[PDB]
Assembly symmetry: D2
Homo-oligomer: 390 residues x 4
């Protein structure tokens, strides 16, 4: 019942930005151009300064656009740099509405930093249309959403938000598509103005690159954003560019497997007597399940659950994992487990967390590409060991 | 007559941050750790790294080395020099004023003028070369003073110690010195009263024209924490490979900067004696207006030589076109010599630039590490091809 | 009905050698250690790293992972597949004979015939496609037997286990199997009785077409020790960064190989359907003359498809020249699809290295190229 | 009084092979080209070879995965039944390869004191095909008359002279200028200078020799990683400033040690007390940071001395930016037979320094304090 997979996705992942006719070599894999300057044929003149920038950032960028079905893509030092740059599209007096449940670092940036520079920040859910409709003002100029949301995996109707945000006039809708990747979801096809990623996660997928990507269609938006790319200089390294472009080549066969494993894990957890509740859009227990099948071609490896009992039971459970690793980050090849309230989302004010449901009993799992059976044995084994009140 | 060289510079460039006891292998050169996360013994720890962005072994060594070379207690690395500036100005709030030196690098000019001002920051450009003008320009709302010495490209020299006294006399206002041209080998703005010593590492620090990078050295405790927080929240972070590479560059900073100074001196002297040259602006020359100041605040000079060819734009252009060794290009500080025409190239971002004396006639040389005789022979030939009215 | 997929492969591909308890930082992904020397506590202490040659953290993790993936005790990493072949042969001495396969990779061929022979090693070549032929060739001086399966490009399959009994009956001889074109996901020569399981990692292991790297997996204690000595003393050694990149690529070997197989199968069945294709050679087809051996010996197949087009060389060229998705290039085992005319093994033989692009597209491109060759 | 510096060295280290017109980007620093496939050697290696060629005053250069793999490729020029003559004090590894590996494949190995030209001339056999020289030698710093050797070896036909120039680098010594046939480097040392690349370099002029080498570089497959090539080429850009600071620092350290009453004897080419000092000046533009000496007393004193170094590091390599110390008889030259070392002067009491680029005052202080501690 899912949206049928995007035609040509793998072919494009492999071949776009990657044409051999580009180099004197004819090489299949693009060379890494570390250099910061370029010889000019005459003063008023190709490439001129690496930060503006360069061959390897450009290849990555043509490829990510393609996969997003976009005309343009822009690459940054990190997902937060992408965010901070995106917010620089605005001015003092502007308002930003932000999905109430959102990456820790995003919350922090909007609440404690952008609010210092004449920007009004409102937190809204935004998974409920009429609340968003209410919060919009003549001052509103950016609407930032995430779906599913990190860590609670609330799911927003993107085309729904798109239609309503664009009725009001000149308002930019950004969708942070970190969790799903353009393999499973194309915010731009659903009417978003920007589709943004922390490429640190699934896009690169190999836990060895920190990076941001922003994809766009609108001509004037692209130009304004390109300016900010050069002017803020929050730019990724050419080597980082390369590694990430290398990671994309397997995005499709990585996301499929995250899908299989994720799904199995969420099914196993939901049948387990020691688990209170499982949130995973791929399950029919998910309140937005039907929506998910309309917006997405599948699901990812992110499974969040509440363990029965207290933080002490959550801790014993984490401490007994022998294959999942207790760490921050996600979307890598390796399975990771996490206690958002005290780790990844510690920078979200305690009251904000509790309204959100980020309790001491919430675990976020990032299901990796290991054997299903082993991920399953490890979870069984750890939950047995915690044995909370049933 | 220069300040004596800083005592343990060469030793510190090679050892600080670099202790083998840090690694289980006892490696003499720090490993490149690309890893995006790290395993945690327990949820919510004090100890160890947690997330690369915040963050990491290879960046942290580099930061430790640079701090030492700046004579500072802390350093922070960033994706670019520009991002280092953006982060620094995020230190402030709406209603605050920044005062900026007048001939400043084109990019810092643009960000302050065209981006920072749209967020309730008042930007004033002041010829801080005339100390009393700075004292006059200071208002209750003044939070940051941004200074560059020598200035790129006209190379006015600012009395850091004199500015520092004035900027510190009343209120709580920060003095940044962009020390990109000098490197901490030739000038220590912190020793002279600046609150922050900032680098575009892309230039001399790295020296090999293959890393874009920024650096902020700082002593003050609460200013550091305020910076550290922004480094993490805005995420304009550098790649670990770039960190590795830049730290690798630093190992020869002393031997490179000595050669830039020898070669730089010889080129300047040669230009001053040449009938086709109108004026040579070079700190190491008796003819530079702030020459004696240069000797009180610096242990030496750099490979940045600027002069005005006699005649017209056509003459500048022809001279540039005839260079066979010097390359026509936009960066600086590398191992190879670069020639540039600020008006139409690096400083394209007109009025203010006529006032500053960035005319058609003006040429910026970045003298590199090639053989002096060859450098001289290249200039000669090229000046001869243009043969301006003498 | 292939061999069951080897248990825990994906899990070991991802975790063996990657234990974060190795690094003071507990990094989840091993640091790249470029360091050439290591501080020593006292002169000639027994312990730890001393010289990168020799070797080093990053190389060491890769060796541990590959060994696990081959189901071997040990592995040694080399600057390339040829360099591995050379180190392996430095295992011998003047007066020894090596026996090599008939249809062996051009590289190992060139080195044996043109270089190794010059130093008192008899090389003599043999069709191992038939086991009694290998019997006959064995000599009181036979010290090494070099096999490669499936062969490239005619794709003949060699009964590995069969050759192992024949060869091991005569003392003291090493069986090397070049597993470059299967990868340990699909074939484990050591579990089959080979003494050595050799790779050119340049191909499928790394699969990203941006590393040259050889790999030797071994079980036997003395043979490992001998090999390690040649690793350090001849110095045909991998850069730590290549080590890293190949380890990075390993992390997706399982999902990459399933897709190569899936796509290769689809291409093979498409060609076997097409009236303009004389003949398809692909081990996953019931039409392949060693198909049964394949299912007893492998867990599946690869993206390598060979075919003969109807007509002549002209028709082969028109096809190759009209490919829009498949690239004309001389390599294989990467994520991209490559086509090649291996003679320029008759006028008419075409080799495909089928990649990870969309099935529909690969099929449409072939179909369109065959039509250009043979109109309407 | 040394040979005058080579004109254009710096200019050429920075620009040769570095021409921006080679790339569509017009990049000032050459890309790192990682590919192993090409749409119908690699650019990053090629740039490095050209630069080293220029620095050596050579027509050609070949890059290898280590200096050890360069030595092996070279020996592969010969056939069984031929003879190698090697300098009697070589790098432990060169000694090991010749004595323990090469000798197993029909080659005859002979060691000779070539610092005594009379002895080399007597040693030459109708089937000598290669003479292998290191100067100054590692670690006893014995110096050979390259030119005098060259004339002696070329007097009767088809013998190759290799000069291992690792210690000097082409900034201080150009063996090819002096009549050598091959100028060989472990680039792992001074050439890269940054302690993070393992590599070998071979420079040659002779046309037939190069084609032979080029053949072997391809067939043996001990090629370096393109990334490593990038990194070494990057190191080269500071060769002249590095080698000049090594010279000052080395010199100051030799002087200090020679004046220190706890030091029995110092061996350093830049000192008048070196028996070949005068030769060093006719043959070289300067000296390096390699300073070897004998501490007064027994093994205990050497050991206590090493334990108290606080700036120099106890490690097993050389020629990098960091100051290094080792005790050859126990570390770096354990692979040379005990009886070999005694004859060679590698005793319990010989310490080899690699002086780096730290401030001179600190290095002298660290040695002062270490010697005081060993001898109160
Ligand atoms: C981690 C994350 C980010 C920020 O990306 P970085 O590269 O870590 O700065 C943004 N959005 C989401 C949903 C994330 O999970
Ligand atoms: C180039 C430069 C900067 C910032 O440049 P980046 O290219 O973003 O590293 C800052 N100050 C000076 C003097 C510069 O030349
Ligand atoms: C170390 C060394 C070698 C061997 O080179 P590697 O890069 O260690 O394989 C050869 N010659 C000399 C003089 C050396 O010091």
């Amino acid at each position: 019942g899912f949206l049928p997979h995007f035609q040509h996705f793998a072919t494009q992942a492999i071949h776009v930005g990657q044409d051999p006719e580009q180099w004197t070599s004819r090489a299949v894999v693009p060379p890494i151009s570390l250099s910061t300057t370029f010889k000019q044929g005459a003063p008023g003149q190709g490439f001129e300064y690496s930060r503006s920038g360069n061959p390897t950032r450009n290849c990555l960028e043509k490829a990510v656009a393609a996969l997003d079905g976009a005309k343009y893509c822009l690459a940054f030092a990190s997902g937060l740099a992408a965010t901070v740059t995106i917010t620089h599209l605005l001015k003092a007096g502007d308002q930003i509405i932000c999905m109430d449940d959102v990456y820790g670092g995003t919350n922090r940036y909007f609440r404690q930093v952008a609010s210092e520079f004449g920007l009004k920040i409102s937190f809204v859910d935004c998974s409920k249309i009429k609340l968003l409709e209410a919060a919009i003002t003549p001052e509103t100029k950016l609407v930032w959403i995430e779906t599913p949301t990190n860590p609670t995996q609330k799911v927003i109707d993107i085309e729904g938000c798109a239609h309503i945000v664009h009725k009001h006039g000149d308002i930019i809708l950004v969708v942070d598509n970190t969790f799903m990747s353009p393999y499973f979801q194309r915010p731009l096809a659903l009417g978003a103005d920007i589709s943004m990623y922390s490429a640190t996660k699934y896009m690169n997928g190999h836990s060895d690159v920190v990076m941001g990507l922003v994809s766009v269609n609108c001509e004037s938006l692209h130009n304004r954003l390109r300016f900010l790319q050069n002017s803020l200089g929050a730019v990724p390294s050419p080597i980082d560019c390369y590694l990430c472009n290398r990671g994309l080549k397997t995005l499709h066969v990585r996301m499929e497997k995250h899908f299989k494993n994720g799904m199995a894990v969420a099914q196993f957890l939901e049948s387990n007597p020691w688990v209170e509740k499982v949130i995973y859009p791929g399950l029919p227990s998910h309140p937005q399940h039907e929506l998910v099948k309309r917006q997405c071609t599948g699901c990812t490896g992110m499974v969040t659950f509440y363990i029965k009992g207290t933080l002490q039971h959550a801790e014993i459970f984490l401490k007994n994992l022998k294959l999942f690793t207790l760490a921050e980050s996600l979307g890598g090849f390796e399975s990771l487990a996490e206690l958002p309230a005290i780790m990844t989302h510690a920078s979200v004010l305690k009251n904000d967390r509790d309204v959100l449901g980020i309790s001491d009993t919430l675990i976020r799992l990032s299901v990796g590409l290991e054997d299903e059976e082993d991920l399953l044995e490890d979870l069984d084994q750890a939950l047995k060991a915690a044995h909370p009140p049933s």
